[PDB]
Amino acid sequence: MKTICLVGGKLQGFEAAYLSKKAGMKVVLVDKNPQALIRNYADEFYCFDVIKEPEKLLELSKRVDAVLPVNENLACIEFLNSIKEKFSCPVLFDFEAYRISRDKKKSKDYFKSIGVPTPQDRPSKPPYFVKPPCESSSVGARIIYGLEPDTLVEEYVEGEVVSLEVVGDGSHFAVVKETLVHIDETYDCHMVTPLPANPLFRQISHDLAANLPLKGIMDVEAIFGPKGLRVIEIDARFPSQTPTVVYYSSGINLIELLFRAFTDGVEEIENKYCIYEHLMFGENGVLIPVGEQVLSMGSDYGKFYEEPGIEIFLCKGEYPVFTMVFWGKDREETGAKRCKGLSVLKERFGAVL
Numbered sequence: 001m002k003t004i005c006l007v008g009g010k011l012q013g014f015e016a017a018y019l020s021k022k023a024g025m026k027v028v029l030v031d032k033n034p035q036a037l038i039r040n041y042a043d044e045f046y047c048f049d050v051i052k053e054p055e056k057l058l059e060l061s062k063r064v065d066a067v068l069p070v071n072e073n074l075a076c077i078e079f080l081n082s083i084k085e086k087f088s089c090p091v092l093f094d095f096e097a098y099r100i101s102r103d104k105k106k107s108k109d110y111f112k113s114i115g116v117p118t119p120q121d122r123p124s125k126p127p128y129f130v131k132p133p134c135e136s137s138s139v140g141a142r143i144i145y146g147l148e149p150d151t152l153v154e155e156y157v158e159g160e161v162v163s164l165e166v167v168g169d170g171s172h173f174a175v176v177k178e179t180l181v182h183i184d185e186t187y188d189c190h191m192v193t194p195l196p197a198n199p200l201f202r203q204i205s206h207d208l209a210a211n212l213p214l215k216g217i218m219d220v221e222a223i224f225g226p227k228g229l230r231v232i233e234i235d236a237r238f239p240s241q242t243p244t245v246v247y248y249s250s251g252i253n254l255i256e257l258l259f260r261a262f263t264d265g266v267e268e269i270e271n272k273y274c275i276y277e278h279l280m281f282g283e284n285g286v287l288i289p290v291g292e293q294v295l296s297m298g299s300d301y302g303k304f305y306e307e308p309g310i311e312i313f314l315c316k317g318e319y320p321v322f323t324m325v326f327w328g329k330d331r332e333e334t335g336a337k338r339c340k341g342l343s344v345l346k347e348r349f350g351a352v353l
């Protein structure tokens with residue numbers, strides 16, 4: 001049995017912990033917040049700030065098999081970069097790739113440098129899409145029909161939002177599984193489903209990884225627009241939501257793949273269906289689709305229910321959020337599991353949908 005140390009116990013942390021458990025690993029969580037979202041889901045929880053008490057993390061590195069940063073606190077990431085050589089185990093992160101991916105303008109410069117299409121900057125005709133340069137989870141992202149000077153202003157690209165994940169070992173780049181990102185009125189993601197292979201998007205994603213070169217994990221997001229694919233962002237950190245869909249649809253565990261990248265290496269390149277979604281239990285049990293910004297306000301996140309083809313997680317707080325995971329051989333069977341999962345909530349917990 002191997003042990004993974006996660007630095008960060010929110011949404012990235014949950015995803016990493018979930019897949020680590022599927023891989024039969026023990027999960028040690030480090031988080032500065034006593035109310036860290038996944039504190040009770042991890043096998044061990046150590047509450048400290050790694051910047052304030054680095055010696056505690058370095059000591060932990062002697063008794064775990066890897067340390068995975070799963071947060072987007074630049075102060076934390078920059079600090080970890082400064083002490084990474086002192087770790088007694090691998091740090092599963094690409095600091096150079098993250099420096100590029102965290103800044104959307106820097107990323108767009110990178111896309112342009114290797115000839116990858118990306119939305120036009122500063123269009124003359126509405127609608128415009130605006131977003132901050134360095135956020136995530138669609139925070140500050142909005143359509144426009146006194147902005148900060150570094151706000152991105154782009155042409156609004158209509159179409160499907162699609163994600164691919166890539167794990168590189170510095171030499172080989174494993175492009176994994178296409179996923180569809182289902183968006184709500186805030187442009188946040190409330191649902192993820194798998195998609196068939198897209199050779200063009202796979203090649204683009206490979207090239208984005210290869211030109212760094214990536215030793216770590218990165219995802220690529222694109223909009224399949226009316227005039228073709230436009231890459232909107234990359235994020236060189238462990239993603240939330242999509243890795244669960246990747247796991248059930250393709251059989252690939254991204255935590256295992258990332259660990260392999262830093263130990264033995266990776267090789268390039270199941271066809272099953274999966275539905276992953278978030279539903280808030282509103283007033284009187286009204287079920288409402290919500291995105292990650294709502295889950296991020298939660299107080300306690302862990303497993304609620306499981307049967308064959310169904311996993312349900314509950315994010316407690318001011319109105320709970322259920323994260324539902326359904327899988328099966330095809331869309332029909334998966335839809336039937338979704339129906340069963342919802343019926344459990346309906347009959348036993350008074351939900352309405």
Ligand SMILES: Nc1ncnc2c1ncn2[C@@H]1O[C@H](COP(=O)(O)OP(=O)(O)OP(=O)(O)O)[C@@H](O)[C@H]1O
Pocket residue numbers: 007008009010011030031032033036037048049050051070071072073075076296
């Ligand atoms: N230096 C650190 N040491 C320990 N844990 C940290 C550190 N920096 C961030 N974290 C934890 O990582 C988790 C994810 O942080 P991140 O900044 O990515 O998301 P966030 O939603 O902005 O978090 P926050 O609750 O701070 O607003 C949080 O639970 C946070 O407490």
Ligand SMILES: Nc1ncnc2c1ncn2[C@@H]1O[C@H](COP(=O)(O)OP(=O)(O)O)[C@@H](O)[C@H]1O
Pocket residue numbers: 119129131135136137138139141154155156157158161181183187188221223232233
């Ligand atoms: N140029 C654009 N046109 C249309 N929609 C966009 C555009 N850029 C971003 N979006 C939408 O906003 C969401 C968040 O933008 P993204 O660049 O992926 O930032 P992130 O860091 O916040 O998640 C996307 O998933 C997509 O739905």
Ligand SMILES: N[C@@H](CCCC[NH3+])C(=O)O
Pocket residue numbers: 008010011012013070071072136137239240292296
């Ligand atoms: N870093 C934040 C946001 C991650 C959003 C990724 N889609 C968290 O771990 O909760």
Ligand SMILES: [Mg+2]
Pocket residue numbers: 135136137233234235
């Ligand atoms: Mg992003």
Ligand SMILES: [Mg+2]
Pocket residue numbers: 137138221233
């Ligand atoms: Mg995004």
Ligand SMILES: [Mg+2]
Pocket residue numbers: 219221235239
């Ligand atoms: Mg993303």
